[PDB]
């Protein structure tokens, strides 16, 4: 019934607002008419004075990137549990859906903070030019570049938060994660989410044909770059004890 | 609102179940004979000890008891570290403090979780499939004949409170979020979180144990016992480092063992 799908869509959007402090609406405002910009080395070390952070440079930026991801994982976990029927699944399965899902969702939402020329950082207090990041030493200079390419493609679909809120729910409820014990309910929820997302895209983007389909195709792009992302970390194993424990 | 607190109690229980595979519930079942779980091999002498390698999954004996148990400590730290990240606000804190809160919280959380595996006669070992008796341990060599006994005495006193895993989960969190740790940069946001956790604990206790007069207060005092356990532990550890310089401490434990 289209009435309840519209309710599901509003429920998730409200939960997403609570779970994610820096919305896409907010990020896009900041990128388009003031956050300190980081375009080279001098601007960076200036930027710890302006925007306060935690305790060489290529590695320091990589690491602080992990910090944020751990922060992100908690936001996604908290959002995940507001998905109807999620907490009711077998606890191991919830843990399995998150394990394989948080990456795909992080890159999805990193797209909201990026454009052609760089990426907002630190709750949007900052902006890191895309040029400075590729200026970084091999292989560091090559880490965020593949994401920039995915983001600009992805942002071309002109999704808003209310779209993204359902979309990422769909990501979490993937019935093909290894090690799932009871896939019936997982796929039951996903189809519901898929319905809500199909209607949402229609009402919210009437003039955009088959956007639903085009969006589902991007989940190919996501899983590809997630694979390629883990293998890029697994050439930086070619490189505290509690810190490595907090970030494993 | 009470409703915000129950929600926090549930979230914490939920992560606790996800991060610690041997709950107190599983452990009380093994320790009584419940047919939800199968029965442990008991070790009480060197002979029983020695078929236990054939029986249950796993250099003289008292040393590699201490070594086996040592690597078990490491795994626990990882789980507590895993648990800590689920604590609303913990990973947003300053990174130097996160390390700080772990550095001091972790042993107070071990002996709390280790109590779950103990009775007045011994301790489950090897994920539950073993049971090493108190006496056997107390009878080990001159230095290694005093490791476990104080944790036994705490565990006996502590298990008196009759907490379950859903209580422990909040209380384990209150331990981590201790602003009074040495070297904390921003004590203040730490204490807004603990202030909240303690509110959650209070409610959870009053509801889960509606007859246990002052369980909350009584439970906060048990943090006193915990801190004394850690100090006797650490100093007795430096004996071993000097008795047996052939013996190595795992680095993650060695870093926690600072100050
Ligand atoms: C809910 O999902 C997200 C929440 C936060 C963020 C976020 O702020 N990030 C930003 C701005 C970034 C980009 C970035 C670049 C340089 C330093 C960064 O760390 C600090 C400055 C920070 O952003 O707080 C962050 C980011 C990277 C991340 O790891 C990666 F995706 F690469 F696997 C994860 C989250 C990241 C992204 C997704
Ligand atoms: C809350 O997290 C945990 C706390 C304790 C344990 C745990 O299993 N332990 C057990 C059963 C023990 C008890 C024990 C005694 C002898 C050998 C042991 O190790 C092997 C043989 C095993 O566990 O199978 C384990 C234990 C001891 C520890 O070191 C100490 F803190 F005491 F210095 C640490 C953890 C220990 C696991 C998780
Ligand atoms: O990938 C990065 N961080 C991680 C770490 C662990 N898990 C997921 C993401 C990263 C690397 C760089 N860099 O400068 O190479 C810049 C920004 C972010
Ligand atoms: O304390 C012990 N292990 C360590 C070591 C260092 N850091 C933390 C925990 C221990 C020792 C014995 N024992 O009888 O030798 C038995 C059980 C546990």
């Amino acid at each position: 019934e289209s009435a309840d799908l519209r309710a599901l869509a509003k429920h998730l959007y409200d939960s997403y607002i609570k779970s994610f402090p820096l919305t896409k609406a907010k990020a896009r405002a900041i990128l388009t008419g003031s956050p300190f910009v980081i375009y080279d080395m001098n601007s960076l070390m200036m930027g710890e004075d302006k925007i306060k952070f935690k305790h060489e440079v290529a590695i320091r930026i990589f690491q602080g990137c992990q910090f944020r991801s751990v922060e992100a994982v908690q936001e996604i976990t908290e959002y995940a549990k507001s998905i109807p029927g999620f907490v009711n699944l077998d606890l191991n399965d919830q843990v399995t859906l998150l394990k394989y899902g948080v990456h795909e969702i992080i890159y999805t939402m990193l797209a909201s903070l990026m454009n052609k020329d760089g990426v907002l950082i630190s709750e949007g207090q900052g902006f890191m030019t895309r040029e400075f990041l590729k200026s970084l030493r091999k292989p560091f200079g090559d880490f965020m570049e593949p994401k920039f390419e995915f983001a600009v493609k992805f942002n071309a679909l002109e999704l808003d938060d209310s779209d993204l809120a359902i979309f990422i729910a769909v990501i979490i409820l993937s019935g093909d994660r290894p090690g799932l014990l009871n896939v019936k309910p997982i796929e039951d929820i996903q189809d519901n989410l898929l319905q809500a997302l199909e209607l949402q895209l229609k009402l919210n983007h009437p003039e955009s044909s088959q956007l639903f389909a085009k969006l589902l195709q991007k989940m190919t792009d996501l899983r590809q770059i997630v694979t390629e992302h883990v293998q890029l970390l697994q050439v930086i194993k070619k490189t505290h004890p509690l810190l490595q424990e907090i970030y494993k």
Side-chain angles (χ1 to χ4, degrees), chain A residues 206-218:
Chain A
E207 330 91 314
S208 182
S209 192
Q210 286 298 311
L211 182 65
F212 187 59
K214 310 217 273 324
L215 179 52
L216 299 177
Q217 288 178 296
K218 302 283 158 304

Side-chain angles (χ1 to χ4, degrees), chain A residues 4-15:
Chain A
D4 317 342
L5 295 191
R6 291 308 307 154
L8 177 58
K10 177 156 196 326
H11 169 66
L12 299 164
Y13 171 78
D14 292 342
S15 160

Side-chain angles (χ1 to χ4, degrees), chain A residues 5-216:
Chain A
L5 295 191
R6 291 308 307 154
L8 177 58
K10 177 156 196 326
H11 169 66
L12 299 164
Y13 171 78
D14 292 342
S15 160
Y16 165 106
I17 281 313
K18 304 183 260 142
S19 291
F20 300 105
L22 177 37
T23 80
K24 184 196 197 175
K26 299 206 216 166
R28 287 295 134 189
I30 287 150
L31 298 178
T32 77
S34 266
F36 171 92
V37 172
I38 299 188
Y39 49 92
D40 64 354
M41 290 287 169
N42 315 137
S43 49
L44 167 76
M45 81 165 278
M46 184 24 57
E48 105 169 318
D49 308 39
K50 259 270 176 200
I51 316 155
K52 309 317 192 144
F53 282 118
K54 309 293 173 270
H55 164 283
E56 82 146 299
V57 155
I59 287 109
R60 257 194 260 97
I61 298 175
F62 171 39
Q63 291 178 7
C65 212
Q66 319 188 254
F67 175 97
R68 190 39 177 112
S69 316
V70 161
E71 297 203 288
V73 173
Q74 289 309 312
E75 290 161 18
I76 296 163
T77 299
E78 179 205 75
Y79 174 69
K81 289 151 148 224
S82 93
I83 302 167
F86 181 81
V87 294
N88 289 137
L89 307 160
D90 174 272
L91 287 196
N92 307 266
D93 276 359
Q94 329 190 7
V95 183
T96 296
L97 293 184
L98 293 179
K99 173 72 190 98
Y100 299 93
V102 282
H103 289 274
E104 275 155 37
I105 289 139
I106 287 169
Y107 295 142
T108 291
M109 291 188 88
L110 203 52
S112 310
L113 317 179
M114 285 169 160
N115 64 42
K116 269 160 30 51
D117 301 307
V119 53
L120 302 172
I121 61 142
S122 150
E123 304 110 271
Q125 309 209 312
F127 177 92
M128 278 220 79
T129 174
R130 173 193 202 161
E131 204 49 273
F132 176 35
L133 301 148
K134 169 71 130 198
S135 93
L136 299 193
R137 215 230 285 161
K138 293 179 179 179
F140 292 61
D142 265 306
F143 229 64
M144 309 274 326
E145 197 53 43
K147 326 203 163 321
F148 273 118
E149 292 167 66
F150 166 77
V152 195
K153 294 221 224 135
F154 186 85
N155 288 332
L157 298 123
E158 295 185 334
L159 300 186
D160 67 23
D161 300 303
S162 72
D163 310 324
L164 285 172
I166 318 182
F167 180 51
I168 84 190
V170 160
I171 296 191
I172 302 181
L173 278 298
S174 286
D176 48 288
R177 307 301 190 181
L180 288 179
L181 293 185
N182 181 9
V183 180
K184 216 199 157 23
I186 283 173
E187 284 190 341
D188 279 349
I189 298 159
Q190 216 196 41
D191 299 356
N192 225 339
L193 294 160
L194 279 162
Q195 269 144 35
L197 173 63
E198 186 180 12
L199 191 52
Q200 165 66 26
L201 291 190
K202 289 198 188 199
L203 315 181
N204 191 32
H205 305 257
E207 330 91 314
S208 182
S209 192
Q210 286 298 311
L211 182 65
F212 187 59
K214 310 217 273 324
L215 179 52
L216 299 177

